[model samples]
Target: VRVAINGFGRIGRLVMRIALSRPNVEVVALNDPFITNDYAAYMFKYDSTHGRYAGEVSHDDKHIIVDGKKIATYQERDPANLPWGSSNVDIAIDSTGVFKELDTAQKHIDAGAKKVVITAPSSTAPMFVMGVNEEKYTSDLKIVSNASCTTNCLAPLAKVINDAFGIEEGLMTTVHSLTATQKTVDGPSHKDWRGGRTASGNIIPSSTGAAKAVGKVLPELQGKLTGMAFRVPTVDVSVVDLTVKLNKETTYDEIKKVVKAAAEGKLKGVLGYTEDAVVSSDFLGDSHSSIFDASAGIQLSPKFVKLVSWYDNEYGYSTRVVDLVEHVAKA
Candidate 1:
């Protein structure tokens, strides 16, 4: 199936790389305004950021070879201008982080896409957390949102808690890595609050809407969840610290067992349960949305449980965007 990425930034590029690796998937086009130069130069310049397997990208006259296959890139953003409909693109993945509303998704459909998938959860689009609630998908749904990387990493834990023992309330603290949105060096920009801040040197306390977005995907927890974010000095890996108050008596072992079992090849491979201690860098290019640390569960009380999970925010979430697109395509 041919797929077009609507934003060729960090997450968008990763989606292209992962899609190119899949035999059935072809990156027919890439949409980004910043990619004005040749696609090969972009790949060469960002090779270091592509991780250890950076040698896979090459170029020829006709195509940009990613994992030995040639692909095309486009300099566009607005869905109405792209060749998605004409090129017969089965799905368009909006990794641009711009179209987080149903109205914007409708524009993509009007432009000629059979399905539109957003990498981040939208206010109106049906939020999907692969393993937790994929069965909720239906054919009539044209636009879908793959809840953010933070949401993907946290949803499974929340789901397990909600299922095994009802959660009364919870607080989530995501120690997420800095994104391209932050200033690499101190500089003045439009937003006065964040203009002169150095993201690489400090832990910035901020609010993440993932907590609210999670509720959209898992309706049972609406108005009961809240979260905050710490933008740590890192490039990729992110950690989620979730504390839940349970309604029923539960032990750490029971919670861990449920998480491990659910993540063991269940729910479209969105969850991973591991016994080894993994640092942020360990999940650099992991395919799964979240890797559950079975050993990281801590029981504060019979009703309160703390769990930790790690994710390569860009890589993990980008792959999930594709997964959601495929899921939508099959519907």
Candidate 2:
């Protein structure tokens, strides 16, 4: 798969790194009008949260070379004006978090990409979470949304539980880490009052579309789940707190067995099972979409359970985006 990354932001940059590490996929082009090629190479080599790059990095005006692989670079703000066609990019990932609408995203196809994957949630495109509902994807899908990091962590767990014990309804609360959307210091704002406050000093309560977005991929759960988020000062990693009523009575042990089995079987790479009493920081570089906290499973009643799962929001979610890209390429 020949891939082009737009935006070169956190998710976009990581997608390129992860995609290059893979054998089948090749990152051929990158676009971000706000970021320069030198800065892109610098940031790519020395990511604060993910640690230093494993290979040498160098850059020129036209390209950035890492481990002798040269990737063409561009400073185009408009996707419609990108060089994806000449670059032979089979898939373009819009990590820009802009051009999220159907027609706007279509500009990538016009610019010459067989498929486009939006790293964030989008109402205009179909959503796919690899292990959860990626099987629904077809080659005909020109634009796709990977949803959010929270949805990636929640969907697989929800699917496993729903299939095993049947979910009656559920409420989720994610103890999430900060995103670029939140301010480092207090500032004037319009979106949410709390978002303007210093992100490093407060546990800002915010909303999340993950729950409702999950239903788009797994239609049975439509309107059955709702969720919110609390953005903490932590740099990375987040946990999902899911409380659901099951159609059948179940105990903590039974739930654990099913989840663990899934982790080892069908959902092996996508879901992780952990028995240790680990904190959120322990999952900073974890690649699993969600790691089942076996130690935190609780059953409030025979039919009601509270399950917790941890995720490296950036790394894990970016990995899924790459997985989706490779999937669509083969389709």
Candidate 3:
């Protein structure tokens, strides 16, 4: 299947890298307008935060070579003007996170794509948490969202808890990495809200819409789950600190058994469990949506458990985005 990606930023570049490795997927096009001549050369050499080649841009064919394979690349900014139909792209994945509304999403269809998938959840699209409700997918569906980086981590955990023992309520805090949205050298504020902050020096408290998106993806957890986000100094890996209240008492060993079982290639690679104490840098190249640290799982009470999960916010979420696109295309 041919897939087109809009926005060749951190997330979009990672998606292209992963797509090139898949046997059945082909990256037909890439769209990013902000990458100028100077910025393109730097991004192509190696993304400092990701610690991997952002891919080589070929001036000859207007393509990006990821590990020696050429994939078509474009510099288009407007979604409505991209050449999805002319290129014969069957699916488009909007990694830009700009087109979050239904009206903008429909423009992909108007541009000749059979389906459009967003990396982040939107009000107009059907949000999917793979291995949870992926079976509900249909070919008729046009727009699908894979949820955000934080929601992708929380969804599976909530699903396991709800299935094993009902959840009463829960609180989560995502110690996330800094993004392109923040300032680097303490410059003037671009947005009125984030103007006076030093992104590198502070653990900025911010709103994470993931909590609300998680509830929507897993309807059973509605009103039962809520979370906050803290953007840390790190530039890559993001950690999820989840505290869940269960309907029944359970020990740490029991919780470990349940989570480990799901992570050992269970849930179709949606979850990964490990005993290693991983640093934020450890997840820099990880491709899974959620990597469970079995050794980090704690039993605060017989009925409550605290767990730590890590994800390469860009790479992990990007992989899920393409997976969602392929799933919808085959449906």
Candidate 4:
């Protein structure tokens, strides 16, 4: 698959790394007008959260070289002006957190990309969570959304359990890591005043659209889940604490069995199971979108169940984007 990345932030950078590890995927070009090629190459070479990239990374004036492969680079600020046509980019992954609307995302197609995938949640694009409902994708979808990292982690868990025992209703709270939107030091936030505090020092209370967005992929659970987020001080890895009231009474052992069976079978690659007493940092580079903690599944009552799942928010979400891109290329 020939790919182009539009925004070289955490998601964009990780997507490139994950794509490099895949057999048929290749990032042909990247465009981030805000940063210099030198900075982009340096950031990709050494990631504080992901550790040093194991491949050689270097850049000349117009190209970033990784492991002897040269990738074209551009500094176009407007999506309509990018050189994706000349490079014959099959897919353009936009992680800019901008150009999310269908009309705006359509510009990449106008610039010669066959498809565009937004890295963030979008109201206008068809949302797909890889394992949960990627089959819903059609080739006619010129613009698509991979949804948020939390949605990626929550959807599969909700699907597995809902399919097995049926979810009456649920609430989720994600202890999410810092994002580019938060502040490193005290400042004014146009979105929320609390977001102005130093991100590394506070457990900032916030909102998450994951619960509501998951329904877009799994319509059976629509309006059945609600959620919020806690932006913690961690650098990477996030956990989702989900509490649900099931239609049937079940024990913790039975619940674990359901998740474990799915992890080993149908959801093998997208869902995972763990028995270790692991912490957030332990999941830093985990590829699974959600790792069900065997020990964390609890049965408050026969109908009430609480579960915890871990996700390498940055790495896992990006991997899904790459998978989605690959699926679109073939479909």
Candidate 5:
């Protein structure tokens, strides 16, 4: 698959890293307003968070070269002007996260990309959570959204449990890490601000779109879900703390049975199970959609319970972007 990455942020950078190792993907172009050819090469040559590259990272005045392979690099801030057609890209994955509105997303298509895949979920696009509702993608849809990491995690858990035991309602609290939108220290924020506080020092609480995203992916729970988020001072890993009111009575053991069985069989790589009492760092690079804590599956008073799952939000989400790109290429 040939791809053009629209932005080289956390997810965009890793998408290149993962694509370098994948046998099927070839990056055609990387777009970020700040990166010139040499700077792009330098950043890819050494990323402190992800560590050094195993493959050669070099560049000339026009492109960032990875192990003798050249992918065009540019500083186009405007989505409608990127050279998608010129690069012969099969699809363009917009990790920019800014051009999310339907009209702006369509700009990428109009600019020449055959199809556009959004790295984050958008209300305007058909949110295709790979394991949950990939079957919903149709030939008529030109744009596809990979959705958020939290939505990817929630959808599978909701699908599995909601399939076995019905849910009365769902609530989610994503302990998300700081993004590029946040400042290192408390810079500026009004009331109920999340990233405005010191991103590296405080656990700032605010609203989340996961509830609405989940509703979009799984319409059955449209009016029965709600969510909030905490911008925790962690890097790489994030957790989804979920609580659901079950329509049917069930025990922790029963929920555990359902989760464990799904992890081994039905869900496979999409969902995982762990009983090691692992912390967030343990799954720093873990790629599973959500690693369900079998021991922590709590059922309080029959219908109420909590489901805790961990994700290397950045890494896992980028992996999904690549997967979604491949899926779109095939379609």
Candidate 6:
């Protein structure tokens, strides 16, 4: 796959690193308005949360070089003006999160990209969580969403549970870590002021569109599933606390067995099962979307259960974006 990554921000930079590590892909181009091509390489090398990059990531005024591979980058703010054709890019990953709308995402294709994949999702475009709803993909589609990190973690678990034991309804709470989206201190007066406050000091309760976005992928759970997230003081890794009301009978052991089977069988590479006394920090470099906390399941009855799944939001989600890029290549 000849790939391009737009918006070399947090997810964008990581996608570049993860994609370069893979065998079958070449990162041909990158784009960001506020970020200069000369300094974009620093985001990959020095991450305060993930520690320093132990590998070489050198850069000049134009392009960033990694592992002897140099990819061209553009500073164009508008996707329509960027040189996607000249870079020979087959697909573009818009990690900007600002281009969730179909119109702007379409600009990449209009500029000569064969396909455009957004890191965040859009309702108009097909939202795909690889293990959950990949069977719905069509070659006629030019744009798709890789969904959010939370949705990627929740979907596979919802799938396994919904298939094994029917769900009446579900509630999800993501104890999420801070992101580059938030400010280090309160500085803005926008509608989302809580997100503008200090990310290092608070456990801010916030809105989550993950539940509704999941509905787009799984239409049956349209109004039944609800989601909310807390922006914690941590740097990386998040946990999904899910409570599902089951329709049929199922024991805690049965739930564990089904989830274990899921990790080893169908959802092997995407969903994981862990029995260790692992915390959120333990999942730092872990790349799986959701790691079933095998030792942390609670059963209220045969009809209800609570499960927690952990994920490395940054690196793990980046791995998924790469996987999505490869899917478009294979298709």
- lDDT scores for all predictions? 0.78, 0.91, 0.78, 0.91, 0.82, 0.86
lDDT of 3 by residue, 165-213 (tens): 7788888889988888787756665453553477899888877778767
- What candidate 1 gets wrong by more than 4 Å, as runs, is 37-41, 52-63, 189-196
Off by over 4 Å in 5: 190-194
On residues 1-331, what C-alpha lDDT tens digit does candidate 1 reach at each position?
7788787677777787777667777777766666553664455337454554455666554456665555666666567777778888888888877887889877777878788888877778888877878889998988888888898888877887788799899899999888776787876656545534798887877778887777888989898889999888888789888888899998888887787778764644778888897688888788887887777768888998888888888887878877777777777
TM-score of each: 0.91, 0.98, 0.91, 0.98, 0.95, 0.96
Candidate 1 overall lDDT versus native: 0.78
lDDT of 5 by residue, 145-177 (tens): 899998888888888889888989988888887
Q: Which ten contiguous residues of candidate 1 have the minimum total lDDT?
A: 36-45
Candidate 2 lDDT tens digits, 1-331: 8998888788987888899899998889888888888899998999889988899899987999999899999888778898888888899999988888788899999999889999989989988998998888888889999999999999999999999899999999999998888898998769798998999999999988898888988899999999999999999999999999999988899999999999999888899999998998898778899999988878889999899999999999999999999898898
- 129-166, model 4: which lDDT tens digit per residue? 98899888999989999998899999999999998889
Between candidates 1 and 5, the TM-score winner: 5
| lDDT of model 3, residue 18 | 77
> Which candidate, 4 or 5, would have the higher TM-score against the true structure?
4
Candidate 2 colliding pairs: none
Candidate maximizing TM-score: 2
Q: How good is model 3 by TM-score?
A: 0.91
1-331: candidate 6 lDDT, tens digit per residue: 8998898777987788788888998998888878765577777788886677778888877888877888877888789898887777899999988887788799998888899999997867788888888878888888999999998998888888888897789999999998877888876839787888888998988899987777787877777788899999899999999998998998899999999999999898899998899998899978899999988879999998899999999878888989888987788
lDDT of 3: 0.78
TM-score of 4: 0.98
Model 5: clashing residue pairs? none
Question: How many clashes does the backbone of model 6 have?
Answer: 0
Candidate 6 runs further than 4 Å off? none
> What TM-score, to 2 decimals, does candidate 5 have?
0.95
After TM-score superposition, what is the CA distance of residue 247 in candidate 1 from its true location, in Å?
1.1
